[PDB]
Amino acid sequence: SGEPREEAGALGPAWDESQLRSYSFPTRPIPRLSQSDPRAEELIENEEPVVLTDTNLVYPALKWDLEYLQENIGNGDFSVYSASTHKFLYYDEKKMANFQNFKPRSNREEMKFHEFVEKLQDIQQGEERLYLQQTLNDTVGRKIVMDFLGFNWNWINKQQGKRGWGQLTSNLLLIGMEGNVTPAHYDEQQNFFAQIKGYKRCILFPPDQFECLYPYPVHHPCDRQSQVDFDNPDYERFPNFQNVVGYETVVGPGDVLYIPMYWWHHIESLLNGGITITVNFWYKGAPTPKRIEYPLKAHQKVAIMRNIEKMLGEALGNPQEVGPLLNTMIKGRYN
Amino acid sequence: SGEPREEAGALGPAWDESQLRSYSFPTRPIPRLSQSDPRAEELIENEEPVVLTDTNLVYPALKWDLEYLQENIGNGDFSVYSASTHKFLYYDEKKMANFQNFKPRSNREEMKFHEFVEKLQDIQQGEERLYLQQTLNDTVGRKIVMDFLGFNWNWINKQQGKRGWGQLTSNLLLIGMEGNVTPAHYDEQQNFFAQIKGYKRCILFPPDQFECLYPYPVHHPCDRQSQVDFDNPDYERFPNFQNVVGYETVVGPGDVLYIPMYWWHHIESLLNGGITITVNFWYKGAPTPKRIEYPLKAHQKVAIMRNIEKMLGEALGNPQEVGPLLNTMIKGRYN
Numbered sequence: 001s002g003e004p005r006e007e008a009g010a011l012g013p014a015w016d017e018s019q020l021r022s023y024s025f026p027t028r029p030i031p032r033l034s035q036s037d038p039r040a041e042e043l044i045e046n047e048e049p050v051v052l053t054d055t056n057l058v059y060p061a062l063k064w065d066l067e068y069l070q071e072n073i074g075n076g077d078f079s080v081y082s083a084s085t086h087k088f089l090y091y092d093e094k095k096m097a098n099f100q101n102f103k104p105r106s107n108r109e110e111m112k113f114h115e116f117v118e119k120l121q122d123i124q125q126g127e128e129r130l131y132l133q134q135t136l137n138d139t140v141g142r143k144i145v146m147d148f149l150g151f152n153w154n155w156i157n158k159q160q161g162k163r164g165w166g167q168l169t170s171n172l173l174l175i176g177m178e179g180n181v182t183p184a185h186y187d188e189q190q191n192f193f194a195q196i197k198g199y200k201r202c203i204l205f206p207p208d209q210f211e212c213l214y215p216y217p218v219h220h221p222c223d224r225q226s227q228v229d230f231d232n233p234d235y236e237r238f239p240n241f242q243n244v245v246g247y248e249t250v251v252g253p254g255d256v257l258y259i260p261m262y263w264w265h266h267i268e269s270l271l272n273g274g275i276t277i278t279v280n281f282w283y284k285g286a287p288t289p290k291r292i293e294y295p296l297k298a299h300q301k302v303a304i305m306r307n308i309e310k311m312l313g314e315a316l317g318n319p320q321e322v323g324p325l326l327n328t329m330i331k332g333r334y335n
Numbered sequence: 336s337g338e339p340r341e342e343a344g345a346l347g348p349a350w351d352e353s354q355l356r357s358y359s360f361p362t363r364p365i366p367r368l369s370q371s372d373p374r375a376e377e378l379i380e381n382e383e384p385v386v387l388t389d390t391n392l393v394y395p396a397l398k399w400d401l402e403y404l405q406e407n408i409g410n411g412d413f414s415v416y417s418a419s420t421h422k423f424l425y426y427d428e429k430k431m432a433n434f435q436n437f438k439p440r441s442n443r444e445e446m447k448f449h450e451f452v453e454k455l456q457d458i459q460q461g462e463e464r465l466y467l468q469q470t471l472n473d474t475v476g477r478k479i480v481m482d483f484l485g486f487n488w489n490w491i492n493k494q495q496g497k498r499g500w501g502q503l504t505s506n507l508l509l510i511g512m513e514g515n516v517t518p519a520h521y522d523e524q525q526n527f528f529a530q531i532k533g534y535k536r537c538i539l540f541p542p543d544q545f546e547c548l549y550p551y552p553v554h555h556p557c558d559r560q561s562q563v564d565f566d567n568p569d570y571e572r573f574p575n576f577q578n579v580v581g582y583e584t585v586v587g588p589g590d591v592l593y594i595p596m597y598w599w600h601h602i603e604s605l606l607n608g609g610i611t612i613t614v615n616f617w618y619k620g621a622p623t624p625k626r627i628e629y630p631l632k633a634h635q636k637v638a639i640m641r642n643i644e645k646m647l648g649e650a651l652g653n654p655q656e657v658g659p660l661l662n663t664m665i666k667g668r669y670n
């Protein structure tokens with residue numbers, strides 16, 4: 001992760017190790033570079049993570065905080081997630097019909113910002129934890145729309161153009177509480193993670209560690225999430241979690257982390273670090289080349305495995321038979 | 336800026352986008368309200384811009400044009416500014432002694448109105464551009480003095496009384512040519528911008544965008560002006576110009592724009608819109624409250640920075656050392 005950076009103005013260290021959680025695997029630091037540095041462009045083009053420290057991407061939002069937001073964001077509805085533990089168990093509603101025994105571990109709920117601020121206030125007066133996650137569309141107040149327009153769209157748009165990425169699928173505003181943890185998972189789109197308030201420790205695993213992270217079945221509501229409990233790894237069920245090695249960093253106000261598509265990421269708001277605020281940017285990856293180019297990269301093999309699982313689930317007319325058939329194919333033949 | 340307003344009498348649109356220049360930043364419309372509307376009074380009291388459409392402030396001047404003026408204004412002298420480009424580079428004479436390498440980019444020149452009208456005529460027979468700017472004192476013809484007396488002094492005086500503003504520092508008559516551009520800058524006084532003939536696009540930036548507009552050093556002849564070339568922004572020298580968001584409008588005959596003190600403003604006479612005529616009104620802001628009131632507003636912090644720069648320039652007995660000392664104070668200590 002690297003030594004805690006010293007804040008300007010002789011203010012103490014931004015954070016200290018005691019705020020970071022302990023895990024069973026090793027890690028090395030993700031590079032912190034300047035957007036002008038040729039090495040940063042090199043990392044992004046090769047689809048490797050990099051923390052850009054001077055993009056000014058969300059510059060107008062650095063002043064944001066709960067008071068400012070509540071007052072100017074408006075009186076619309078915001079999706080607030082809640083959990084009893086620190087780990088926020090998110091899931092896919094549409095895939096619940098496939099796994100009837102799946103009991104929910106986290107509940108969402110629309111509410112007004114001022115309500116979230118209040119509901120958050122008394123919880124600080126507690127084991128419960130909330131996590132607000134909502135898109136930054138025009139639906140919001142005029143002032144917030146001005147700040148939004150003030151983002152460095154010149155930088156990010158140029159970045160989108162040279163990488164060949166597709167459309168910006170969405171912008172997500174995230175406000176969480178200290179200690180909050182979003183378990184490891186991967187997304188299929190390219191992502192620029194812009195930190196605004198507070199610090200978050202981000203642990204990333206490359207796509208080739210698929211075999212050590214044991215993702216749920218594609219048809220399961222937790223598709224794309226790791227089945228391993230990072231706080232208590234079951235080595236009998238997931239032996240290869242003992243070989244996992246990750247890339248880590250702690251991002252703070254002004255930092256932008258590039259999370260390449262298909263890369264795993266574990267995110268946590270530093271303990272006793274106050275609330276955190278982040279805005280993420282999603283872009284569809286560049287279209288896959290017409291003619292295949294070998295040797296296939298790891299993320300491409302992951303795409304293929306996802307496709308096989310999907311096709312099989314439809315061909316058998318039932319996602320619950322996917323596993324049995326796969327075992328039938330493999331046992332005594334390929335294993 | 337808003338859709339071009341349709342002129343009365345089924346005359347086409349007042350103007351069309353093709354007449355507006357293209358810039359790298361986003362903008363939203365300044366409210367166009369009636370002076371009777373409570374929202375307008377609310378905007379002015381909170382020191383936010385607003386275009387009042389029915390003040391009748393300069394009603395008698397709406398008939399004005401070059402012929403009428405030349406004939407009745409008199410045979411006195413008028414300060415005419417000239418430039419080779421469209422951007423009029425104005426400067427402070429008194430501060431030239433501090434920056435000897437500063438070469439002038441625009442020249443002033445007293446001349447008689449009929450001469451200005453003539454000099455303007457052949458230029459339309461060209462890259463040169465002129466801009467007449469002179470005060471409306473009794474020095475002028477009897478007829479122009481009658482029109483002047485006919486301004487709605489009842490409205491503006493009442494406005495001056497309720498806002499607590501100081502004396503009317505001056506009245507400026509402005510006559511320019513289509514395409515003319517006055518680069519972004521801020522004034523320290525409150526201003527009512529009364530449009531009389533033609534249309535002008537006005538782009539304003541609030542005081543809190545100080546960090547994105549990079550004003551010249553206080554001792555520089557271009558003090559209060561932005562160092563950024565809006566037509567070709569140097570993002571390496573002024574990275575934060577990528578985060579600038581402005582408030583825009585196009586004022587025409589009869590409109591009065593309130594430009595709050597310390598607010599930045601970029602003004603341009605619509606392309607192929609003919610000459611433009613404007614009269615501005617300057618008032619010293621209301622005296623700063625005896626006991627400070629936190630949290631300080633942005634314009635107050637700008638006042639403080641200007642004061643520090645001024646004091647430092649005198650304390651070191653030389654304005655050229657201000658920068659070196661500021662860097663010495665900051666480097667490795669606050670940055």
Ligand SMILES: O=C(O)CCC(=O)C(=O)O
Nearest residue numbers: 174182187193267278280
């Ligand atoms: O910040 C977080 O807690 C989660 C971020 C995340 O999963 C994402 O941006 O995809």
Ligand SMILES: O=C(O)CCC(=O)C(=O)O
Nearest residue numbers: 509517522528602613615
């Ligand atoms: O109309 C213009 O070109 C400039 C107006 C201006 O700068 C002012 O009224 O202070």
Ligand SMILES: [Fe+2]
Nearest residue numbers: 185186187265
């Ligand atoms: Fe994610």
Ligand SMILES: [Fe+2]
Nearest residue numbers: 520521522600
């Ligand atoms: Fe001005």
